From a paper:
Here, we report the complete structure of a bimodular ∼760 kDa BoNT/A large progenitor toxin complex (L-PTC), which is composed of BoNT and four non-toxic bacterial proteins. We found that L-PTC/A consists of two structurally and functionally independent sub-complexes, the M-PTC and the HA complex. The HA complex is composed of [name], HA17, and HA33 in a 3∶3∶6 stoichiometry and adopts an extended three-blade architecture, whereas the M-PTC is situated on top of the HA complex platform. BoNT/A absorption is mainly mediated by nine glycan-binding sites on the HA complex that together form multivalent interactions with host carbohydrate receptors on intestinal epithelial cells.
We next separated the HA complex into two major components: the central hub composed of homo-trimeric [name] and the blade composed of HA70D3–HA17–HA33. Their crystal structures were determined at 2.9 Å and 3.7 Å, respectively. [name] consists of three domains (D1–3). The D1 and D2 domains, which adopt similar structures, mediate the trimerization of [name] with each protomer contributing ∼3,100 Å2 of solvent-accessible area for interactions. The D3 domain, sitting at the tip of the trimer, is composed of two similar jelly-roll-like β-sandwich structures. The linker between D1 and D2 (residues Thr190–Ser205) is degraded and not visible in the crystal structure, which is reminiscent of the post-translational nicking of [name] into ∼25 and ∼45 kDa fragments that occurs physiologically. Gly399 and Ile400 of [name] are located in a loop that has weak electron density in the crystal structures, suggesting high flexibility. The corresponding interface residues in the HA complex are located around the center of the [name] trimer.
Author numbering:
A (entry chain A), C (entry chain A), E (entry chain A): 20 to 189
B (entry chain B), D (entry chain B), F (entry chain B): 206 to 626
């Protein structure tokens, strides 16, 4: 369930890179390439696409989350001011059409409260990382799985992680 | 030959696909003629971030461009409409034999915003969000064929991307969202507050333990609808409490739009999800409450559907009841009482059937004990569409017909309960 | 001749992409690559190399041309404000020298007046499109055809087109 | 051993090729030493658009840098001299075996601007327009050979691009351009306006129907020249009207520079082209007109050339006439009258020959009817250079010798008409 | 020694491209690439990394050096204002690690005074040219030669040159 | 089990390698999941030039960040600490079979700044200069294994680059640098100026002709040290003169730190190099001079070492002398006089040995002629470490023991001269 072999108290948790968010999949748009050509989509992580997503709880407000995350793990406020680019390249096979679309990935951080081997409270922070492309080869009028276009719940495209540190009192 | 849209009343945003271009080369970036062996690139480097979205509407005053954008943000979380930091680039190496041409077009992702009401679209907007291009490669043109004159096509679009239809319901912004800050356990009674009198509104709630719940208003009036907030409960969490993530993207689960229809809801709720209840415009100044009850008994057999309470069944003959038809594989249920005195001997002949939609039905006898409601399955696999089969039931007894729609031929479902003797 | 199977009146005509202009061929310069190396020339269509070329007539002044062209076909004034780049790559064969030179391509638009199946008046607009490279392998002192360097009359490097719409009166 | 330049008087811009670099590494961008397997790139990304053209002139006061640039714009339509948005980039992958070096140099395209007058260049400018680079790859240097000292080369250039000589005449900007706004049909008479008195000027005109035209001034004085505007008539078009595209790039067709030389022009004109006529400095205050006439008859045999009217042939003996020689494969014609009374019997021995240039000649007898001029071909394939062959012609009769230059040994052509009896 | 078959007087000398400077080798940093990936390091020669290094003598001060060098050879003050980029690409072999590091190269100029076939005075100018990468494949804990990391004395990675011109008196 | 650091007193900057990253993903740029066939790039385009160096120190007041940066500039000529124009980019093409992940990290080059004094570090700073990245590629993760919880590592670094230890001595900036502007020939006497009284200082000098030089203060007090400036004499040059290139990066050649130790230096100097002499804090107000003398004779056998003058050898028995041990393969020499009257017959038994360090020794008899000093080699390949072998030498005679350290077990070398009879 939400059971965890840890002592009572608060924790910062790095849950890994490679998280993609629900519903948000196609909002950057995509390319259609054809017949031997190569498509290359990319982005640049600066300023107003590097603004993170906070999800606080009664115990853990935003400031608390930011401060603990940046103390233990990476300081995203300093890092995300310096532009970093990324790109993906796909090649269309002869006499076929390829569609490729781009979405941001995030590092998922958590603040958890544990009481009697149980997580009774959890705050979440998504910090923009890089990106991820999905591609499909298609025919005119071919029906495509909804799952290719639309993500219902947040998932991690890599292996999830659980890197914790206990938070001590002021 | 129009498809029946069995959508519930309200707002929908529909992703209709990527790679849309306009007619008559209005979105042609241009053509490269690459000699054999060589390569050619067309690049969108985003040295300027400006983009040019296209918008049309049927109603400037409700579905303005602003409103429509807000709806796209509610549905898919789009937030850059005028701008883009996303690069795209097309590269082509011509084979050793022949020359090659590449044409590059700008593209759009097409979104449609509808207000769907009682079986038709009453407001419609199309928003074309700037996308990441289309690249067709062709063989080098030969000298000279001959140039054949052609008239321009009508104004419009052409989709070069793959087929896509993603339908996402959205919370109507003109209606209030009240919250039940405590997670619901076995029972809960929500008093309807004066801050939201008369106007329809939503109630955002969550559940402590995954299970089937009966939800209704006082005396089963008015009829309620229930939605699931899409992708909720994936993030922040407080035990036994509601965590509102401001998600306005909603999946319709069940419920009638006709507010004068007596009904109750029986739905499977997850603890790791949030749900919205929509209570409609009520034309009465009387106080009302929304009752939530966890079902541990036979009522669990009715998930997920609304149950119409049929009251006017007090004579023999022809009785018919029209509701919005559920979609294929979805459910609708009717609770009725066979007219006459219950003396455990007197019996009537009952014929249940539909007029246009095909549905598989299962019939339940309902008795209430001191342990709750009991449902005895007395008839299975009833094929309702123009059914001629009849069954003898007890005068004064109470039955529930559960109907699964299997062939959707009509926006409405018309149930007939014909009684003889 | 200038005979056309259309009714009397005025017309907008898109004559296609891939037009190159006379005399202008080598004015951007070119590269000399050698012995296995790769040369890559390119440009960026913005502002003052995207300014179009007008050729009006007594009936069809510049404003008329611009307005009709932008109404029916692509609005070049809005488009040519947003930078678009293009590149070409050539590889020199071992122990040989290669020369490659770049020139702009244009979409050719026309406004024509037709009277009794005859074009009696024609205005022309060239809108900057992308580019085009010509290459040649050469020896020291080898004579090269003038035609490789110098274009005497405007031509289309692709198949010409004739996409028309009749213009109706104010 | 100098080439004869049979150019007409006036201004020429000459593209002398691309890939010019200066001596002593003045334009070296630099060297990359690429280890085997690896790759190396040298890039001109145009983060700054500034470029540095090189200019030299013989006459700062006429051919200034401004003037020279304007001339390059007239000839080839160059318009960015200080700037460039054009990227270039050199990439090299070293083979698996050995290391590789690449040297990158900036380059120039060399333009020469000349004022050519009566057989020599009287004003000269060189404009080196910044180009798109030179990339030489070499094998890795070995340790150490030994460094051998070398003196610097003289200042100058080295061409690394392919051989090129593109010669383009340009309109002299100090001279007015008058226009004939109506397309010429069969006949036209242009009165010479007082707005352009004494000074030389151009007349821009076009023709309604492709055909051969005789063009001349009153009494064939002064001599005219005719140019074709390069690439004209490809664009805008108004039936029966001149469309001026402001094209200053001109191809010399025919005509003499000596203004006291009686002559007329016979030229093939296209309806889809514009032409300039240059009328020279006239030392007279008398009115004059330019006559255009479409030739449907035998005069069509004289295209394209100027015809010298020879007047002073009124005695027996040696007569000689010097003009600017046409280029190889171009024409020059002479109309003369055999001295004596025309009585249809009296005859003279005529010897026609050239002194240095070899030319093939055809002889015509000219009679004028009420239907126009008639040309009877009486002699073909005359090899003029030091010709000793003679022919007997009629006293008082009129002849035209058409001469095609086949070997250009002299800037001038010297025709001799020796008459005996 | 410092003996030279030239007459008495002063000389400008271009000693070639491809000079690297002592101690300075690793100050731009380097990349570690692994397992099939490709590393690409590069730079951009503008403004404050194109500032040259002067080494004057009692006879030949800085101004003298600059003026004579720029008169005879390339004018670096005008050239080094216009950005020029360069890049190197290395590929790591499968299951091995590669380290690549970058350093600037320079053209070496000299002003020499010659008296009786002997160089008795020499001023030096280093003008920034492009760059140069060194790479090595390594194992965890493998000892690497100091010579790979650290250059003790200026050397030329190409063949040295000696391109001279005699300087005449004011 | 600590290594003995046989460094001379003073400041050192140590390049400890490239590709350092912090623990707990603090420097992760991010991960790309590349599907098979496709490619992925992570790019540092330097659109902003800002970088973020990391610095720690043991002493904020001497080794501040400013000071430490100045030291890095002295040692390796680093000059951009906050900024960088250097691009890096990682590219990966996934093989046709399987998917691929690439993780990109920012990296640092680690520099350590030490103040080393009498056998231990007394001040220490670590400066992490921003570098050009680390790129690890891995196979695609499989669903799902299972996520195993792990505690965070301690704060610190991990080196992903190759092993590196580059040690560079630097001039102490708190001490003056005097100059000898004239190149030294055979002899030179430098008077010690009052501008630098009492405090230690450096003397920068060069030599006219490559050769071995004896350098010392008056009466061999105080002891001097000598350094070579790294990479000097490669550039500007004036015959017979010093050219100061402001090089503060120094290699220790030889010399003692104990200033009360009588000694002189014998060193091989190059004409194409500059050298620094360090003269220590002298507790006397008496004038002093540094004598330089070119050695053409047998003293050339003592290069490169310091020679201790041993004075207190005037009784029989046990005598011992402690100095800083040279590194392996480096030298130290002792000049002593066998106690007693020199009458060319009387003799004593001498035992020379070390206590912990192993050294190969060669013994010289020293006689001074009118031609200079003469060195007769009377004993070779002496293994000093706990040597039991003894040799009979002449009372009143003068000897020099040259010692090459071969096994460095102790920071100090302890020489014993045991005398019996
Ligand atoms: Cl029905
Ligand atoms: Cl001749
Ligand atoms: Cl010892």
């Amino acid at each position: 369930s939400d059971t965890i072999d840890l002592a009572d108290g608060n924790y910062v948790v790095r849950r890994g890179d490679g998280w993609i968010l629900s519903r948000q999949n196609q909002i950057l748009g995509g390319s259609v390439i054809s017949n031997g050509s190569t498509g290359i989509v990319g982005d640049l992580r600066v300023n107003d696409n590097a603004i993170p997503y906070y999800y606080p709880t009664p115990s853990f407000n935003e400031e608390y989350i930011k401060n603990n995350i940046q103390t233990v793990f990476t300081n995203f406020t300093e890092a995300n001011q310096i532009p970093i680019g990324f790109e993906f390249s796909k090649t269309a096979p002869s006499n076929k059409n390829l569609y490729m679309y781009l979405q941001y990935t995030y590092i998922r951080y958590e603040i958890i409260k544990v009481l009697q081997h149980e997580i009774i409270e959890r705050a979440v922070l998504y910090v923009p990382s890089l990106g991820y492309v999905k591609s499909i080869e298609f025919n005119p009028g071919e029906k495509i799985n909804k799952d290719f276009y639309f993500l219902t719940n947040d998932k991690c495209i890599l292996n999830e992680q659980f890197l914790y540190k206990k938070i001590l009192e002021t | 030959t129009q498809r029946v849209l069995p959508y519930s009343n309200g707002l929908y945003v529909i992703n209709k696909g990527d790679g849309y271009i306009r007619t008559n080369d209005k979105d042609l970036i241009g053509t490269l003629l690459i000699e054999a062996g060589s390569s050619g690139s067309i690049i969108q480097p985003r040295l300027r971030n400006t983009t040019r979205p296209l918008f049309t509407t049927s109603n400037d005053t409700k579905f303005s461009q602003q409103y429509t954008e807000e709806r796209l943000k509610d549905a898919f979380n789009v937030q850059l409409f005028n701008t883009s930091t996303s690069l795209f680039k097309f590269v082509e190496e011509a084979p050793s034999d022949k020359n090659i041409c590449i044409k590059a077009y700008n593209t759009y992702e097409k979104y449609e915003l509808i207000d769907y009401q009682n079986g038709s679209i009453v407001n419609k907007a199309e928003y074309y969000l700037p996308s990441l291009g289309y690249c067709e490669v062709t063989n080098a043109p030969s000298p000279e064929s001959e140039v054949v004159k052609m008239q321009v096509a009508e104004d419009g679009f052409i989709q070069n991307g793959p087929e896509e239809e993603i339908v996402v319901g959205v919370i109507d912004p003109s209606e209030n969202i009240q919250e039940i800050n405590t997670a619901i356990s076995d029972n809960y009674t929500y008093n309807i507050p004066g801050i939201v009198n008369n106007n329809p509104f939503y109630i955002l709630f969550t559940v402590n333990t995954t299970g089937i719940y009966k939800i209704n208003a006082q005396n089963n009036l008015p009829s309620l609808k229930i939605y699931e907030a899409i992708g909720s409960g994936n993030r922040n969490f407080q035990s036994g409490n509601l965590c509102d993530d401001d998600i306005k993207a909603i999946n319709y689960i069940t419920g009638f739009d006709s507010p004068n229809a007596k009904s109750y809801l029986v739905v499977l709720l997850n603890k790791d999800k949030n749900y919205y209840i929509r209570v409609p415009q009520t034309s009465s100044n009387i106080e009302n409450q929304i009752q939530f009850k966890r079902e541990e008994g036979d009522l669990r057999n009715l998930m997920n559907s609304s149950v119409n309470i049929i009251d006017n069944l007090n004579s023999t003959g022809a009785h018919y009841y029209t509701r919005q038809s559920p979609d294929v594989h979805d459910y609708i249920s009717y609770e009725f009482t066979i007219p006459g005195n219950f003396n455990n001997k007197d019996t009537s002949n009952i014929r249940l059937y539909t007029s246009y939609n095909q549905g598989i039905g299962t019939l339940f006898r309902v008795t209430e004990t001191i342990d709750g409601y009991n449902l005895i399955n007395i008839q299975q696999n009833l094929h309702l569409l123009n059914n001629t089969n009849s069954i003898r039931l007890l005068n004064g007894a109470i039955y529930i017909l559960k109907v699964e729609v299997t062939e959707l031929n009509n926006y409405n479902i018309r149930l007939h309960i014909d009684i003889t003797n």
